[PDB]
Amino acid sequence: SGFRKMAFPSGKVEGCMVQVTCGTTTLNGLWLDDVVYCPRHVICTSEDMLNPNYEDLLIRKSNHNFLVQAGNVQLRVIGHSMQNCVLKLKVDTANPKTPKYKFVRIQPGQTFSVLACYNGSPSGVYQCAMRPNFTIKGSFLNGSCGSVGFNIDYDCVSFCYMHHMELPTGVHAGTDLEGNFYGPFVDRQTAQAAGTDTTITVNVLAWLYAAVINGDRWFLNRFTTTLNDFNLVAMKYNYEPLTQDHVDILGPLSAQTGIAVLDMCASLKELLQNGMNGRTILGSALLEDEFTPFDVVRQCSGVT
Amino acid sequence: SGFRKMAFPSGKVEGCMVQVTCGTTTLNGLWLDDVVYCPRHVICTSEDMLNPNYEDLLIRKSNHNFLVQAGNVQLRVIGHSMQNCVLKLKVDTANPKTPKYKFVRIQPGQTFSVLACYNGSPSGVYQCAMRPNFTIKGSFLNGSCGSVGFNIDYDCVSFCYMHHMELPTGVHAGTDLEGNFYGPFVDRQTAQAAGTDTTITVNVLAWLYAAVINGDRWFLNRFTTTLNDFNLVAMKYNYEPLTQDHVDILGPLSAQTGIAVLDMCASLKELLQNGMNGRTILGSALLEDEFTPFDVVRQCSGVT
Ligand SMILES: C=C(C(=O)Nc1ccccc1)c1cccnc1
Ligand SMILES: C=C(C(=O)Nc1ccccc1)c1cccnc1
Numbered sequence: 001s002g003f004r005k006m007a008f009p010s011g012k013v014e015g016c017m018v019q020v021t022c023g024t025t026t027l028n029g030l031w032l033d034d035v036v037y038c039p040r041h042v043i044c045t046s047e048d049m050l051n052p053n054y055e056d057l058l059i060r061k062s063n064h065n066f067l068v069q070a071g072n073v074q075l076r077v078i079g080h081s082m083q084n085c086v087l088k089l090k091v092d093t094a095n096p097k098t099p100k101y102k103f104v105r106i107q108p109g110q111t112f113s114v115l116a117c118y119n120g121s122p123s124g125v126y127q128c129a130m131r132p133n134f135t136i137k138g139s140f141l142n143g144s145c146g147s148v149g150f151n152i153d154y155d156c157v158s159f160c161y162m163h164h165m166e167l168p169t170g171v172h173a174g175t176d177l178e179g180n181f182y183g184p185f186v187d188r189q190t191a192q193a194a195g196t197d198t199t200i201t202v203n204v205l206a207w208l209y210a211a212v213i214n215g216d217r218w219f220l221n222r223f224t225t226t227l228n229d230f231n232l233v234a235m236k237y238n239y240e241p242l243t244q245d246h247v248d249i250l251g252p253l254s255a256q257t258g259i260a261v262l263d264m265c266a267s268l269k270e271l272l273q274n275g276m277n278g279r280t281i282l283g284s285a286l287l288e289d290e291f292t293p294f295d296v297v298r299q300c301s302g303v304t
Numbered sequence: 305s306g307f308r309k310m311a312f313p314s315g316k317v318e319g320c321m322v323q324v325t326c327g328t329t330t331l332n333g334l335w336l337d338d339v340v341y342c343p344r345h346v347i348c349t350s351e352d353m354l355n356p357n358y359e360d361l362l363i364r365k366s367n368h369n370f371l372v373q374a375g376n377v378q379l380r381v382i383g384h385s386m387q388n389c390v391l392k393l394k395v396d397t398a399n400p401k402t403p404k405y406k407f408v409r410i411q412p413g414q415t416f417s418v419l420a421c422y423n424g425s426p427s428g429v430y431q432c433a434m435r436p437n438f439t440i441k442g443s444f445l446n447g448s449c450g451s452v453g454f455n456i457d458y459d460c461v462s463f464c465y466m467h468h469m470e471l472p473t474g475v476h477a478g479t480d481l482e483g484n485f486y487g488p489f490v491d492r493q494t495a496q497a498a499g500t501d502t503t504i505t506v507n508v509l510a511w512l513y514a515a516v517i518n519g520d521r522w523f524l525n526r527f528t529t530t531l532n533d534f535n536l537v538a539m540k541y542n543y544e545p546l547t548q549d550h551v552d553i554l555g556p557l558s559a560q561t562g563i564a565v566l567d568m569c570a571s572l573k574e575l576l577q578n579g580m581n582g583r584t585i586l587g588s589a590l591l592e593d594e595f596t597p598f599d600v601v602r603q604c605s606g607v608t
Contacts, residue, residue, distance in 0.1 A: 285589030304425030
């Protein structure tokens with residue numbers, strides 16, 4: 001027992017990290033097969049970032065301007081192209097450490113692990129959620145661009161995120177591996193509104209189920225609610241409205257614990273309306289929304 | 305910016321994980337050079353665990369009884385020996401993936417990453433602290449024994465923990481890599497007192513410094529305190545007494561922020577006496593003690 005904010009083992013992704021330099025800028029790249037993916041802003045100077053014309057800036061660059069180094073070894077760049085906000089650098093050598101992989105576009109509310117990197121070197125790994133407003137609250141400093149987010153299903157790495165930007169608010173924005181930003185963001189040093197964010201209701205319920213499985217049960221009560229009544233409270237507290245699709249995804253946890261989803265909703269309603277009263281749930285003094293129902297099942301069953 | 309409970313990249317450790325089976329019991333082993341380390345209780349049945357005579361149980365076992373499998377490949381065991389609560393199985397092949405490594409015994413209050421494993425396969429990675437009472441609050445299910453804790457200094461992996469047991473209270477106990485338990489614990493299915501635990505004061509202060517660096521400053525006040533006065537409050541709230549050695553280790557953070565350590569102690573004093581008033585610090589509604597001053601500096605500087 002015990003419940004932790006667990007990340008996937010990062011080994012398969014560490015083997016793909018490279019450093020990419022163009023002019024004065026250095027960031028991280030992801031080397032899969034004979035292609036290195038990286039943020040297209042590697043071609044910008046600080047003069048350019050206020051309003052970059054990426055097509056024009058890329059035209060000034062040749063294959064030999066992109067310096068790609070896999071730890072100690074230099075890769076030979078034989079092609080380059082921009083797809084949305086990413087650059088794809090074709091190299092003459094397939095990465096011998098390429099794992100089985102997919103590129104996926106995750107949905108808001110889903111979770112993933114991030115391998116934070118600097119100069120193509122891995123520094124740390126952490127788990128996070130894609131916020132409903134398509135930002136992530138990460139830990140990224142200058143030079144971390146190109147660090148990636150991913151999930152692992154046995155031996156397959158599904159890459160879902162590449163880091164591009166820190167908004168003036170200190171929250172993070174990035175793209176899928178085809179270079180499409182999550183949310184309304186553009187890769188320009190301009191003030192950009194991240195929409196109103198909400199709490200991921202289905203994940204808070206999943207985490208309350210993880211709390212019950214792991215012995216924290218003080219918040220269970222004698223009440224029940226309906227989706228309609230619960231959603232009036234979710235509205236007041238800036239929580240995502242719960243749907244039957246969310247109830248269905250919580251089915252395994254409801255079956256394992258014997259606590260009907262609407263009964264857990266009534267515990268969540270009382271916690272929203274009353275607070276914790278100075279108590280904790282799984283070592284947290286707030287309602288945690290960074291574990292999906294799949295994460296709770298995976299962690300409570302020991303999936304490798 | 306941003307601050308996360310970050311674990312070390314687990315790749316170097318994933319390459320060392322193996323499965324060890326003896327009789328009916330399967331757990332994880334750590335393969336470094338030509339030795340596989342694992343909990344000695346791999347030789348017990350459930351009948352034995354209430355009061356095992358490990359010397360007698362090991363005498364019934366031969367090299368060929370220890371089945372060691374590195375993913376798909378079987379290792380040939382040419383020797384076995386018990387050192388404290390670990391078994392060392394000499395194999396005929398050095399692990400080709402052995403990183404530069406050390407065995408270290410960490411101090412209470414220090415942090416490390418755990419690579420939770422099942423059947424020799426890595427499932428997830430998380431960061432945690434060794435509690436002042438020598439327990440860890442991990443996420444471990446049956447079959448996770450033999451999973452290890454570690455720190456990484458550039459290319460050197462310092463292994464500090466091997467998981468052995470879950471106490472009836474749901475907290476975790478284990479050993480250094482020479483098989484010595486941290487704390488008073490013994491590898492026997494018996495009720496065992498974990499001492500009174502305390503909050504790691506120096507880590508809470510380090511985390512308050514991380515909060516200031518990352519823009520969360522609401523808790524800063526117009527007060528100061530002394531070590532003596534602060535320690536009267538630490539005593540009341542079950543916090544470790546702060547020493548000049550702790551103040552010295554916070555020197556880099558005090559220098560970076562310009563906030564004298566005793567001034568940060570006065571902010572901590574007010575937070576202990578007043579609570580958070582429904583506010584958060586770095587996304588937490590409680591005072592976090594799982595980041596050391598070294599962790600905060602490492603995360604705020606981008607160490608790879
Ligand atoms: C330098 C960063 C950045 O935001 N670049 C950028 C700025 C605007 C548009 C595109 C790229 C940065 C700093 C900290 C964390 N992550 C990223
Ligand atoms: C089976 C476990 C265990 O505690 N074994 C053990 C029990 C007593 C002494 C030695 C070994 C276990 C379960 C969950 C998490 N971690 C470990």
